[PDB]
Point group: C5
Chain length 307, copies 5
């Protein structure tokens, strides 16, 4: 009941797709299992590269198809290398790059919790078993990571489990237990660009949106919160043309609705202060002077945003 | 007249193309049919992986080309595996990912009715027949589905039918009846993002578009509905730069024409109220004060929109 | 001098590329020619699928390379199937999807005249000849075609011609006449989306662009046609971010220049009406009141647009 | 010392990449060289299509790898066809489409001088020689070329030269002279779209930008050249969302900097005319009235732009 | 212990990906190592092209898989050519184009320091050794490099090192030292387009943003810095739709936050100058007249930006 080593070198994890929950991973995969002894030219082991491997299968070598369960479609395999020993054992070495799937919650946006995953499990093979799992993360921790999109918690996180397929094949004297390596890697998004060049200027206009109350005439207080409407809208443009499309409202995606509210707030006060009186045109004495009373009723309800 | 099992594991259905009526599906396909008995090494069945399969065809194995009828072009096949038995029967196992076609009505937009489809039918083979059809939906129902683009009605919906090709081949002693499995899967769009960060702020400026009537002077009522025109237009920008291009006006695509109207409404009242009088410059006493009479003539005709 | 049948099933024609004059077509291609008789296992004809075809070429089967003349690069062939008979004749069946070229005049834009084309002609073969040409259009006419980008005139339009290549090979005892099937299919663009959500709102602001004349003061008539300049420009934005790039001015692409004109009209009247007088500041009595005299001098010159 | 014919049919040259200096070319390539005589089935020459060619190489046919020097990566080869004669000579015929490199100066933008290139030279072969070079341009001259992106000067322009590689292989008894065909084709950009729907409206607002001087009050002259700043900026938007990114300022790319200047001109005159006086608030009598003195100081310095 | 020559012709380095830290490189790769002598047809060396190479491996030729360590996935190999000598030695020649990885600091943006890299090291082979490394840069220095995205410091920069893999294979009598060529090439970004059509117009509106202080009334000083807010925001639009997305704030990306500040400066002075007095409405005598006191408090703190 065959024992199989696995070793997986991660080289880079790059470019997350955000709609599709996808991330590209590049590296090396290595499997060792001890086969019945063999004469090797010389008597030091024999090295078989790329083209040649398929030939030794035709001659009758067993090599197990190991599959990435959570890959998307098929991957890109670089250099196949079967290195096989005189004492039998055989070591499969493969460079690869391929797209991978996993759940990704992008709601809490520019402060992002995230985790990357590979799952590897033999394709056609029941009781051949994944022995022990290795994972060598070349990528470096508290490094120059302020040059990378992501920071990595985090060191490689293994787990070799057993998998039961209910609806299965046509031979079940107790035989639906496949051996699956699952490899996890934790990460957080580099909240830089999104704060400085993105959260803040939202604030600055969300801010200056309130100085509509320090306007004099009523006719001025109105027509200014209209080219404040346009300022919000044309800022949600600069959102779309930079930010990654999603199907949930994000953090930022809310701060932008906060905009549209604190201005449709304005319009329902300024257009209140002018017709709540006791004569013709007498703007309400205090209502006009919430000048700095609903910014601390925003930073208030905006600390209800933090709820 | 050959019996064939089919089993189809759906893994994910992802990324709908909206122009093209297209959706990518990833999973496993499995076919079993019982062939004339055979000696297998050992006497437990024999497993043939990937490369090797083509070899056994050249040796004289029958394996039927089964075709996805509604695929777009060709798909991406991962791990071919012929598992064949001593008592004859043969089980074909294949990973796959491929683009698929089907009609999709996107009119009623951000509240979307939708259904996904595969059709599978033998390519060259008349009376060989698809026995019984299985379909195992790994994807999960009322799950964390508010992380996914789509919710799934819905469980797998089968149907094995017979297909008649009129204009056909050059042998017709009654022989144009091909066996087609049709698999259906129902879905609805996750109306989240489109409501909160998209339908609502349309409403809020559609809304505040009416406070042009609570303006005083005639000269102010005009020039304000002009930087209200610009507000609508620059909001249909944020539409294009987020929403999926189509060839029909959608729901949202209408609420945006509603905008252009309730402002070209304004311009044909404000420019009416000033020159319908009995002197020089006397703004019509009641016409000016439909202030909240055509918003409930909008929400009125906008409940004719719901007709 | 070999006779060849052709039959071409169109499944879908989808996604036109507008720069490149390109359109993807998916379907089945079938060729039948009668070859010297042959024993078939059993004595009912023999069916050869995919992999196997190349083998029978190596054994010495003739199968003619037929080429799509106007394809772009190479296409995507799905299921090859050689079905060959006891009485000799052979039937080649292939699924395919591929990009195709043809001239396409996109000038008269959202009211588009268009035609799709395949040309098929034997690649290496002079006097082997295309017998009779068939074309089965699965796609349906006055259907639910308001769900599709295109309406189809129109039924399949054939034509088997002969082609002379001047500068040719190194054997010319009268031998440069290749047999080419040409298949045409007519279409018109679904002028929906472009009318309602696109031509009309252009009109509504082209419209309200004229109510700058029903402004009072001179200082108002100016500064309003400036945030009317911006309204046009920011509307041609919503053009670019939706419409397909081209190298000619279209219909819509003109109505947008019409905009820039009827406002640089305004600026060259309003800035005329103020300095054509007989004193200091006396706005010209009638010139100011072309209020509705150059809209019917626009719809006039705009019915010279229809010239 | 082997003689080789070449003939190159161009079918289309399409889609220039502007950053990358790249253009796709589709067509046929043909090479003829006379080899030692051979018996052909029948005695009319023998035609070898696609698959089969590789076989005759394995049997011992010489076929020289000819390489496109300036291709990008590899190209897409359609139909290989070896047609070989009884008297020896062999004719290679190949369909192809492939990306090509060449220097391209895009500075003088929408009036573009340009030239397309292929370079073809044997890959492993020193003294085998390209005999005479042919080039058949199917594409047509002063045709309906106002439907195409480009006009073609111009007829095919050949040149068969010799190439010396300095640092070279490990056999140099005078042997580093490779035979390279260079084919050139001249072109000009279709300056339509870019004039009418693009250079002109830039002019019309660059124009109306000057009517800020025909404003009355000082307070009006300022605040209007501010929603003129915004008009320029939001027009350089419509530039980015249509025009092809480059790393040099183009023609148009300057006319847009001309905009920003003739408005920061305005601001440094209007804000000069108000504080250059001999009292409190007396706007300079003549300075205010350069009303049409720096448009002919623009069209002046703008005919220094033409320098 | 096998000696191997290497020679690497760079043809072009093009299209940097900015998120992914990636750049495409096209050229030729050549390896020579002297093998045990051999009879060559004729007795001049023997040339083996493309298809044929794999055959000679099957007959028993050693050819070492050399791997680009920092490639992304796999590359695009054009023309394989084994040229092997009578005296033994063998010369491998290959055209290639492939994507490459390396750290890239894009912070100091439009004035960019950068370096391109290939690393080449034998894949399966320990003590076979890379002899001496060559690198021929066809691309030209202080050339017409103002037509190219990049300038090249700089001539090819070699280095042949030894690499130790800690966690390694299952044979360690001192054997984990692989021979790696590292090739470097220096570059700087062509700061043209980004200065003239991009840094300057930012300045010009950053500039004219200050002429809000040479406004008269308080009510004017406010409502003008609001359509100055919109001017900044709609200019950061023209940034997104041209500039390459990154995860750090760049140089330009800061000058844009500088904008938002020097306007939220304005709003926090103009709204200060009006309510810091000693009565009803008396605008502060000097505060109003920092007219040209915080531009030299900007160019001041903006020479703290240069810190």
């Amino acid at each position: 009941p065959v024992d199989v080593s696995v070793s997986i070198f991660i080289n880079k994890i790059y470019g997350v797709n955000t709609l599709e929950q996808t991330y590209k991973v590049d590296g090396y995969i290595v499997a060792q299992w001890t086969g019945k002894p063999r004469k090797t030219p010389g008597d030091k082991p024999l090295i078989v590269e790329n083209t040649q491997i398929e030939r030794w299968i035709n001659n009758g070598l067993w090599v197990p198809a190991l599959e990435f369960i959570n890959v998307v479609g098929s991957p890109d395999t670089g250099n196949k290398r079967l290195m096989l020993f005189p004492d039998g054992r055989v070591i499969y070495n493969a460079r690869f790059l391929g797209s991978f799937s996993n759940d990704m919650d992008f709601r809490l946006f520019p402060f992002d919790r995230q985790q990357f995953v590979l799952e590897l499990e033999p394709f056609s093979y029941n009781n051949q078993q994944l022995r022990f799992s290795d994972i060598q993360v070349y990528t470096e921790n508290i490094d120059n990571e302020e040059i990378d999109e992501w920071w990595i918690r985090g060191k490689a996180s293994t787990h070799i489990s057993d998998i039961r397929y209910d609806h299965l094949s046509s031979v079940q004297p107790n035989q639906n237990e496949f051996s699956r390596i699952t490899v996890r890697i934790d990460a957080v998004r580099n909240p830089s660009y999104y704060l400085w060049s993105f959260i803040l200027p939202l604030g600055l206009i969300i801010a200056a949106s309130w100085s509509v109350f320090w306007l004099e005439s009523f006719s001025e207080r109105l027509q200014t919160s209209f080219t404040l409407m346009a300022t919000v809208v044309a800022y949600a443009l600069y959102t779309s043309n930079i930010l990654p499309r999603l199907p949930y409202t994000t953090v930022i995606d809310q701060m932008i609705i906060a905009g549209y509210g604190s201005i449709f707030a304005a319009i329902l006060l300024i257009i209140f202060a002018h017709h709540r009186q006791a004569n013709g045109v007498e703007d309400d004495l205090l209502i006009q002077r919430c000048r700095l009373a609903f910014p601390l009723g925003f930073l208030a309800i905006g600390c209800v945003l933090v709820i």
